[PDB]
Amino acid sequence: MQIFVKTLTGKTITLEVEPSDTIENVKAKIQDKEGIPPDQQRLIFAGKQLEDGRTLSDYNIQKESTLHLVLRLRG
Amino acid sequence: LQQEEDRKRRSEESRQEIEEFQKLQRQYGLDNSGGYKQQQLRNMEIEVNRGRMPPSEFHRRKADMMESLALGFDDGKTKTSGIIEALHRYYQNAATDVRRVWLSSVVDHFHSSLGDKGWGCGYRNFQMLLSSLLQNDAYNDCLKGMLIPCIPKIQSMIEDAWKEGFDPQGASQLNNRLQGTKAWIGACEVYILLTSLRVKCHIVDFHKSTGPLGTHPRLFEWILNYYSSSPKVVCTSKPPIYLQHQGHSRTVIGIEEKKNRTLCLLILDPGCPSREMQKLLKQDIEASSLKQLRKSMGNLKHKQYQILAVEGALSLEEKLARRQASQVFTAEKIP
């Protein structure tokens, strides 16, 4: 299925994923497209930071859902 | 028929996405809704509207603020001096559970004002670190007696580093603009800022916990190695350490080796108000007052910490080498 990943500057990419994909796998797919190492990625959906060992199905991600991608370590 | 159902689903996903996007942009300071000047004035206007501040002084604090912004200088209203010296006296004189303690050089504490409260931590930790460099003769040439810059000036100086060519990826993450924003920053911005001033520094990325129960012993040991090298209390020449975790940053000004051989960091927080730091300047500190500064491994359980440590000065050639290195921005990783 297709989901979107959107940075806080509005840069948006599309990913091909399955519900069984882990968040770790999703970060790898983001690295495949954008070259951003997974350690620099924090994914947010429904106000919660997604955990690496969980799957997209654990979060009710569905077709055309948008994950928000926070980059690097800031505060 | 499902076409309608698909529309309903996409329409709800969109409302959800738009709502969360605006929330996150605001939190991280990237929604381009103004900056320090606006928040100071808006928050002073609230104090007037709440009958807690006469409109005359508002006119005065606004006038002061505008002068400081024009000069680029921090007005010192959130500055507390003397903490290292007070800690020296305490560890020297008071009965403690410390075998040895290593302190940074003199460091001024800076907390956020009404203008940057909620988002200024990275900038305020830069001010604390800079205050140590500015009293250290080793940095006199590359810092030529500059003053502590105000937050908007720090933002301008980070932009200047981006314009020089530092860290284009990080620049793009922050819309290539910090002035007039409330943008959160990190060690990467502080790094290019200091490097652009010919200050030699580096980031160490403690990207996962290294000890039981989610602790970071490698981080504590790194800091011990930074500060240590005979007396019970050692007030070193060394600058403090910028300490980043997700959402907030602080400044490490020392480390205790307890009598039981465990390690305890001494950490300043730009969220601490003046009245709390003043407690440490009272004749004969209260050991209970020192607890807020003391952080053992149990107190540092964020998943990832980055430190930024300063090591001296750079030649122009070395600065330019580091500018180029910053195009593919990496840091030493531990483990």
Residue A55 · residue A20 · CB < 8 Å = yes
Instruction: Round to whole Å and give the CA distance between B243 and B270.
Output: 12
Structure tokens at B52: 């807690």
Q: What technique solved it?
A: X-ray
Instruction: Round to whole Å and give the CA distance between B167 and B174.
Output: 11
Resolution in A: 1.7
Question: Given B108, B109, B111, B121, which residue is catalytic?
Answer: B121
Tally of CA atoms within 13 A in the half-sphere of A45 that contains its CB: 23
> Is A42's CB within 8 Å of B185's CB?
no
Our measurement of the distance from residue B214's CA atom to the centroid of its chain's CA atoms, rounded to an integer in Å, reads 23
Residues 6+ apart with CB under 8 A from B46: none
Angle in degrees, CA B222, B194, B233, rounded to 5 = 40
Structure tokens at B19: 């709502």
- Picking from A35, A10, A37, the residue whose alpha carbon sits closest to that of residue B24 is A10
Which residue of A64, A66, A74 is in closest CB contact with B184? A74
Query: Hey, where are the domains in chain B?
Result: 79-333
At CB < 8 Å, which residues of chain A contact B?
6-10, 39, 42, 44-47, 62-66, 68, 70-75
Query: Hey, where are the domains in chain A?
Result: 1-75
Residue B190 · residue B133 · CB < 8 Å = no
Quick check: bond before B273 cis, omega within 30? no
User: Chain A interface, mutation test: which of B16, B19, B24, B176, most A Cβ atoms within 10 Å?
Assistant: B24
Strand partners of residue B255: B102, B265
- Residue B284 has phi, psi (to 5 degrees) of 60, 85
The packing angle between helices B36-49 and B55-71, to 10°, is 170
Is B272 an annotated catalytic residue? Answer: no
B79-333: CATH architecture:
Alpha-Beta Complex (3.90)
